[PDB]
Design a protein around this ligand. Structure first.
Ligand SMILES: COC(=O)c1sccc1S(=O)(=O)NC(=O)Nc1nc(C)nc(OC)n1
Ligand SMILES: COC(=O)c1sccc1S(=O)(=O)NC(=O)Nc1nc(C)nc(OC)n1
Lengths: 350, 349
């Protein structure tokens, strides 16, 4: 059965985070409810981790890291209920870790007794939130140029829009340093592994690898922020509206950037990213310039002796993918290309 | 034994509604920073995970976490031993675990603006509440005060950080909308058994009154009692002679009577005092809450029901906390759940 999965073991655990404290002392004779900050210890910014291990794994464990506003659900199942990459790669004899990063899903949302995110006089995260709409996500993920529209030959699981957009939500303003820190701790716990990232976690996975030699490879689906050595960001054009820019590239010390040259790295992009300026469709143009910036980032890694590559799925014969290729209708073929990358670098061997 | 063979597994979203911002969406304008303009937001949906064994027997089980928790508590214990999800797939039941609206992978309804506010509309409150480690320690009866264990405790000592890290706040989503999501899941699944915990105790009773597909309930340490409207019995205050337990939920008698048509078991752990305990607020709270539940079960049985209270010490299990299904003896706790399922024909096809 394509759906059957045999697990030597499965489970979940929490890792990372810190504690913060309220004032005063806790008295167990006083009413505990309504909950109070008095005498309080709060665990904040911890990460949820799920693992599924096949019988007799072959090669390195994979750590699947959801994109912005998502959770590990996107690796479990597609919106129309087909197997996600978690099942596919357990079947491919890898132990599979799926995370809900701090601030998302089963990860901690740091809030207390008081306005959201505030512990007495300390703002742990902002009370004002941000969150995409269905319409924003539709064009961000390139389902089509405008909400309700689909590109010709789309691989989106059409009809399951409600399921898809229901998986998306806000992220509190946890520092990216603390998100990276949690995953570094996971990588220390797991040992040698491969990070598989998506969108917002693209740049975060690159950062983890510079802090954790156990990261032996990276596959990044549609990364949202580019990374460069400090002071060496190339010229990147504004968008076609002559006012907007892509996400400010993340800059790291060259001593850390050079660590990215020591491992195989592949960035994967779906379809319908325009080649030419598209002033009518902001997020399509955003993707054009963002993919361009990533091509320069990978070049910089390769000029330092790296093993970085850009895979456009259409060049591999796969047409119509959205920015979530691993939950599209052809996600088995997308998984096959990930299996190819792992095999090429011996990451599927013991 | 950690091995598990799954005919299939996966997850999906169910339930919820939408709310909309003002104005219209223009794809030519900058989409980031995100805006409420022209926005449709999906809110209050629920996350559902399922694992199905080869050749299932009996009814699927729906495990429903307590307050401030997620489906994690059914996956593994804080010290990494198998949770009820694995144990009951091994027992050849299909197992559903949920993250209810507002918790974990369920939706937290917030937008662009102060938390929970969509323009001038308060969808959930901006001011949150959340237990501390200290409050949860005594709530769950690890011991009488933070950092202290009962001598007989079944808690997995040394894994305190892991345990408390699984808990968090819940936004002020209406209980009606949480019950609605699970009713919709139960409609989708078909005949099933609800296994609830703490805060989800009263919610699961409510679901059963709306969903004939619920064929049985096992509730671990339920936090709020339920009675027919206007028939709440005399319940004393706590030993401090000032505090009360949670106000019992009242439902119309025509709905309450549906609880008499299925087997219902409430399960309590150890170290609930028999006598007033004014020095330890949450120990005394559990004394009076357990008493209220005993009266609620009695009311169900007076309508022809089959509602029972299982005190784990009477079954030979000593020292359980208010999370018996993640304690050190959770395999023995699971055995008693399998016994209940077997007696009532819920483990046969
Ligand atoms: C599928 O492709 C994505 O999904 C994309 S594309 C751009 C973003 C995303 S994302 O994962 O949702 N969020 C992020 O990358 N995070 C993020 N969000 C905001 C509002 N600003 C900043 O930096 C200024 N970063
Ligand atoms: C282990 O036993 C529990 O875990 C208990 S005991 C009391 C509560 C819990 S709980 O699950 O955490 N929270 C709830 O039952 N929810 C809740 N919380 C508050 C502050 N007030 C109200 O009453 C409207 N309900």
């Amino acid at each position: 059965s394509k759906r059957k999965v045999v697990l030597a073991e499965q489970g979940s655990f929490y890792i990372g985070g810190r504690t913060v404290t309220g004032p005063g002392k806790f008295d167990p004779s006083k009413p505990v409810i309504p909950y109070s900050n008095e005498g309080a210890t709060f665990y904040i910014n911890q990460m949820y981790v799920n693992f599924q291990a096949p019988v007799r794994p072959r090669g390195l464990p994979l750590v699947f890291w959801h994109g912005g506003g998502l959770t590990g659900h996107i690796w479990e199942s597609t919106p129309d209920g087909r197997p996600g990459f978690q099942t596919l790669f357990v079947q491919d004899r890898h132990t599979v870790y799926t995370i809900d990063q701090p601030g998302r899903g089963r990860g901690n949302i740091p809030t207390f007794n008081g306005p959201f995110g505030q512990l007495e006089e300390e703002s742990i995260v902002n009370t004002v939130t941000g969150n995409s709409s269905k319409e924003g996500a539709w064009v961000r993920d390139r389902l089509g140029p405008a909400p309700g529209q689909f590109f010709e030959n789309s691989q989106f699981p059409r009809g399951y829009e409600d399921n898809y957009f229901k998986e998306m939500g806000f992220s509190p303003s946890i520092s990216s340093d603390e998100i990276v820190d949690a995953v570094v701790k996971l990588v220390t716990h797991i040992g040698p592994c491969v990070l598989v990232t998506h969108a917002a976690s693209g740049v975060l996975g690159m950062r983890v690898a510079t802090h954790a030699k156990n990261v032996r490879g990276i596959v990044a689906y549609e990364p949202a922020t580019s990374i460069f050595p400090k002071g060496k960001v190339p010229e990147i054009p504004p968008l076609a509206d002559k006012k907007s820019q892509i996400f400010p590239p993340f800059e790291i010390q060259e001593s850390y950037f050079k660590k990215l040259a020591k491992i195989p790295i592949q960035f994967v992009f779906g379809d319908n990213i325009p080649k030419n300026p598209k002033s009518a469709y902001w997020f399509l143009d955003w993707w054009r310039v963002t993919r361009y910036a990533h091509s320069l980032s990978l070049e910089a890694i390769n000029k330092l002796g790296g093993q970085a590559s850009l895979l456009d799925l259409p060049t591999a014969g796969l047409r119509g993918n959205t920015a979530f290729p691993f939950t599209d209708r052809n996600n088995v073929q997308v998984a096959s290309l990930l299996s190819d990358f792992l095999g090429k670098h011996g990451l599927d061997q013991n």
